Design a protein around this ligand. Structure first.
Ligand SMILES: [Mg+2]
Ligand SMILES: [Mg+2]
Ligand SMILES: [Mg+2]
Ligand SMILES: [Mg+2]
Ligand SMILES: [Mg+2]
Ligand SMILES: [Mg+2]
Ligand SMILES: [Mg+2]
Ligand SMILES: [Mg+2]
Ligand SMILES: [Mg+2]
Ligand SMILES: [Mg+2]
Ligand SMILES: [Mg+2]
Lengths: 169, 204, 292, 159
RNA sequence: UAUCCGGUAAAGCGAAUGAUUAGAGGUCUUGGGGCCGAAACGAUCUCAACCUAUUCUCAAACUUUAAAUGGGUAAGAAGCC
RNA sequence: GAAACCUCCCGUGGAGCAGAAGGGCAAAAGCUCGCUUGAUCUUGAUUUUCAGUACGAAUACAGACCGUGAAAGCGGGGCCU
RNA sequence: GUCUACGGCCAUACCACCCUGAACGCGCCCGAUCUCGUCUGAUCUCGGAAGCUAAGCAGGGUCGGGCCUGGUUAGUACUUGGAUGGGAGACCGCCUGGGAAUACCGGGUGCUGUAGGCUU
């Protein structure tokens, strides 16, 4: 009989790190835009790495943060391609989880020889009512303690909500 | 090779440690500041013989090491290979200098010759713990070790238990209290203060 | 495991930030520029029209700063407004206007400049400001303390500021962030501004919801539907309130007495209680373990 | 030969004390100096506009001018053989009221109280101060218990 | 007699910075070498760095502390009311 | 993959602030944007080196003409040396 | 008793975890038509008032860390002035006045200004 300790999805994060720049990245930005229904953001590199073939302030990745119902919907699709399995290590100690998909057309998108097959990266910021405290301007705070989502608590939310297994190893 | 010990004796200059500024310093002769059975428990060595200094003088790394070997050799030969623990309690940190002559006194400022310990009046140089059997063997060890140092140093047997800060009269009771708790060579003094969950690990 | 970031050491070396900086209240960078006088002004005040919007309220205070703790010459709250006419929407821009306006009038009534400096009456919305009359006591002048509010176009603070300006305080301002001013053109309507002052932005939303879906309107404007505040009633309501403020701004409080004087709180546990309490925990541990 | 630089040797002088860095708390700014206020100068690291020179830190002097956010302040600086009263323009943040004068004003106020009264009475009162006189004649009762004997303690070597 | 200024002596390093000894404890890390292992955070040691309490010993160009001696002001008619 | 991008947590500054080092600095003095030319015109006063001359460097004002900000303000080069 | 708004001094006010919060507040909270701003109504801006003290916030708690303040350390370390004092030197003792700092052990754990609530 808890009032608002209702573990919800605060946001869903999606990022395609092509690590190229130019055209490949502009191509991958269309994929997220088709998926999420909003323009994404290009992130640039921190610093040059001659190994990976990247340069400082060169656009490496594209990403986006989905919120609300659309984030619930896209999360659902992402678990369907993963078949509602995760692991213990897929959850972070902070009570967030995430998982890859190897190819976006699995979610439900049409391939093109140009706009190819960008594998991508789901990550779910779980939260509660009254987490905003941390990130507002004026009278800020820290979210107590018996209110912070545990790893265990986030696993059981997944185990209930999306009927998942959380396989061991 | 190096200068006589005569010439670097009195604590004349400011302390000049190996640092950003003073560099290219040659490594100290003495390195291993303790030897014997150092992996021993507080209980199995309470004697604490000290060589105290009675001159505000500088001791050479060279003379420390030599004194350390001298004492340890005798301790081994006398009682036994694993029957003591000796602690040297003066590390050569002060860097000593040397203006060398093949220009004259123009631009004379030394290169680092060597390192040295500065020792105050009443400060301990070496210290030894072993058994109540073995008092005389330590004394002579420190006695022999005196001859490697310049100046003058008393040999003294402290009223502490081992190399602990606690008076040996009260050491055993304190353990019975659990004021004090063995911790390798040393002993952890527990007070009242800390949360009660610490107190529940003891008394249980 | 990792290196403990917050050691003894950490706390020994740690410096707190000021109390109100911790509480997330006072921008001391801005406070210094706002509040301190020029030393050659000496003890002449430096007033500021503080305005803060709470989740359910708008406060308007005039204050100068002394060393004991900045003194408050006058105040008006949005929760007073029921007296004057405003039943609902007390955090809305129109309410902000009333609340500011009311502060000016109440302030002016103290100094006897109620008859001099009527200020703007008809509510155009355009650039207005008070010229001090010669051979008369000059116009009161303070400055707007926005606080931590993101000072954008249409911010409710500037709703209050507009009010106190029309009320007859000379507070300097531009019209670059009254609601009306256009970013991609750079002119000011001052009929858009009037609408906002009169609550027509709210009335139209009310009319838009009722047209589309009854239930959402019923949900959105529940206290508006109770008290019977309708879209067509709205403009009149705020104009009545403006007049009533303008005719009597004086605050009378309530004569508070008949207090039982009882402790809701929990007082501080005395040394000796705390001293025993560990004593009992020590015993209780011992007697407990001497069994199993 | 040492460098003539303005800030040479103020590593410690202009350095906020331990756990008193950051915002210059506001009383400092908002307290009023008139003409002829006795004022002690004490440079501060946070505020670098209007800093006094390292020679006038510690030194007390009188205010002569008051601008918008600073105070002209005559202070006496010795130079080998000659003391030069000279006038410097310190920003408020480096300046306090010197209490040195207030204890004097307290005493003169107390004197004016004690001069008005004790005039109608007739009994004249000591207005001048007087240094601590020798401590008067008095008895000491060794009440019952006798004195406690103090033998000096025998030496022993601790270290 | 009031009142400011100070960062030297000393002291400190279970407080920062840097130095530095020892054992307790720790698969934190991970390793490189082993011994018993096909291999296994399996067992057993080990030495690397890191960390949890302790511990030895230091600083002209480090310091939480912090003297003595020391430098300002002030102690009235150019003042009070 | 030890290093690419994303996300949550801790983080008294252990980063950064052109350069030596010292000081100073966290809803900044750091970073990122928006608008800019106060690095403009003009009297004296003062500080620092000092002989208490110059130079340079700086501090407080004052008068113009601007900038920016809702405003209080800040700005006549570079946080200070 | 206690809160809100603006505060002064800035840890006796910080951090950690634990418990309790009547009324009024303060919040979280529900929305995006308009103002405003985002990749994203998360923040920011704006319009609300169905829920709830879970969190923030307050008050308390902990043989808590930390900070504050006493003791001890110690008349010890240091030190002004003195001697045709000692001592081969290094250094030390006395006279004359001044006098610290850890470890260790106690106690304390925000005070308060202006304006306005609530407990009628
Ligand atoms: Mg020879
Ligand atoms: Mg020398
Ligand atoms: Mg601001
Ligand atoms: Mg110095
Ligand atoms: Mg020293
Ligand atoms: Mg700059
Ligand atoms: Mg000007
Ligand atoms: Mg929302
Ligand atoms: Mg709560
Ligand atoms: Mg609660
Ligand atoms: Mg405590």
């Amino acid at each position: 009989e808890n009032p608002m300790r209702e573990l919800r999805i605060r946001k869903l994060c999606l990022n395609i790190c092509v690590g190229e720049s130019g055209d490949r990245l502009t191509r991958a930005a269309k994929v997220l835009e088709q998926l999420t229904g909003q323009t994404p953001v290009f992130s640039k590199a921190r610093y040059t790495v001659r190994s990976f073939g990247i340069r400082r302030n060169e656009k490496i990745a594209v990403h986006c943060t989905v919120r609300g119902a659309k984030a619930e919907e896209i999360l659902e699709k992402g678990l369907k391609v993963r078949e509602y399995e995760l692991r213990k290590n897929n959850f972070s100690d902070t009570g967030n989880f995430g998982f890859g998909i190897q190819e976006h057309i699995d979610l439900g998108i049409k391939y093109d020889p140009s706009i190819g097959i960008y594998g991508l990266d789901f990550y779910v910021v779980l939260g509660r009512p009254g987490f905003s405290i941390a990130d507002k301007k004026r009278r800020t705070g820290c979210i107590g303690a018996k209110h912070r989502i545990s790893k265990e608590e986030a696993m059981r939310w997944f185990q209930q909500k999306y009927d998942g297994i959380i396989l061991p190893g | 090779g190096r200068r006589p010990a005569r010439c670097y004796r009195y604590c004349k200059n400011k302390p000049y440690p190996k640092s950003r500024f003073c560099r290219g310093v040659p490594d100290a002769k003495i390195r291993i500041f303790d030897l014997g059975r150092k992996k021993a428990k507080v209980d199995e060595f309470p004697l604490c013989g000290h060589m105290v200094s009675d001159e505000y003088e500088q001791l050479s790394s060279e003379a420390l090491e030599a004194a350390r070997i001298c004492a340890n050799k005798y301790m081994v030969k006398s009682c036994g290979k694993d029957g003591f623990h000796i602690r040297v309690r003066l590390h050569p940190f002060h860097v000593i200098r040397i203006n060398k002559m093949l220009t004259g006194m123009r631009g004379a400022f030394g290169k680092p010759q060597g390192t040295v310990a500065r020792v105050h009046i009443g400060q301990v140089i070496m210290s030894i713990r072993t058994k109540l059997q073995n008092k005389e063997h330590v004394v002579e060890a420190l006695r022999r070790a005196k001859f490697k140092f310049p100046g003058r140093q008393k040999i003294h047997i402290s009223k502490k238990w081992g190399f602990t800060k606690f008076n040996a009269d009260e050491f055993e009771d304190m353990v019975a209290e659990k004021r004090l708790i063995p911790d390798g060579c040393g002993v952890k003094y527990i007070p009242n203060r800390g949360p009660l969950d610490k107190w529940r690990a003891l008394h249980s | 495991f990792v290196k403990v970031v917050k050691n003894k050491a950490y706390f020994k070396r740690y410096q707190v930030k000021f109390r109100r900086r911790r509480e997330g209240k006072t921008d001391y960078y801005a406070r210094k520029r706002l509040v301190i006088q020029d030393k050659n002004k000496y003890n002449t005040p430096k007033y500021r029209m503080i305005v803060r919007v709470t989740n359910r309220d708008i406060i308007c205070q005039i204050a100068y700063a002394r060393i004991e703790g900045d003194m408050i010459v006058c105040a008006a709250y949005a929760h007073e407004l029921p007296k004057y006419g405003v039943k609902v929407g007390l955090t809305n821009y129109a309410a902000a206007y009333c609340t500011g306006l009311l502060l000016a009038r109440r302030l002016l009534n103290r100094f006897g400049m109620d008859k001099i400096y009527e200020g703007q009456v008809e509510v155009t919305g355009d650039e207005y400001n008070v010229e001090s009359i010669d051979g008369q006591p000059g116009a009161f002048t303070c400055y707007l303390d926005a606080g931590l509010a993101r000072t954008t176009t249409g911010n409710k603070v500037f709703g209050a500021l507009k009010g106190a300006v029309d009320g007859g305080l000379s507070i300097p301002h531009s019209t670059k962030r009254f609601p009306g001013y256009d970013s991609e053109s750079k002119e000011f309507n001052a009929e858009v501004h009037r609408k906002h002052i009169m609550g027509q932005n709210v009335a139209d939303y009310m009319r838009y919801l009722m047209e589309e879906d009854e239930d959402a309107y019923k949900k959105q404007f529940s206290q508006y539907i109770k008290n019977n505040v309708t879209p067509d009633m709205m403009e009149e309501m705020y104009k009545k309130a403006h007049a009533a403020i303008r005719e009597n701004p004086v605050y009378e409080k309530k004569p508070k007495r008949e207090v039982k004087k009882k402790r809701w709180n929990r007082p501080k546990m005395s040394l000796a209680q705390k001293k025993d309490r560990v004593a009992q925990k020590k015993a209780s541990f011992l007697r407990a373990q001497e069994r199993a | 030969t040492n460098t003539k630089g303005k800030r040479r040797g103020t590593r410690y002088m202009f350095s906020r004390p331990f756990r008193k860095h950051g915002v210059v708390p506001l009383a400092t700014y908002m307290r009023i100096y008139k003409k002829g206020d006795i004022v002690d100068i004490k440079g501060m690291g946070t505020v670098q506009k209007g800093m006094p020179h390292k020679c006038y830190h510690g030194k007390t002097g009188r205010v002569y001018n008051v601008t918008q956010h600073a105070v002209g302040i005559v202070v006496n600086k010795q130079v080998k053989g000659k003391i030069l009263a000279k006038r410097i323009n310190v920003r408020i943040e480096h300046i306090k009221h010197s209490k040195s004068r207030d204890s004097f004003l307290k005493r003169v106020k107390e004197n004016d109280q004690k001069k008005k009264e004790a005039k109608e009475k007739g009994t004249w009162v000591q207005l001048k101060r007087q240094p601590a006189p020798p401590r008067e004649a008095h008895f000491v009762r060794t009440n019952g218990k006798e004195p406690e004997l103090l033998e000096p303690i025998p030496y022993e070597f601790m270290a």
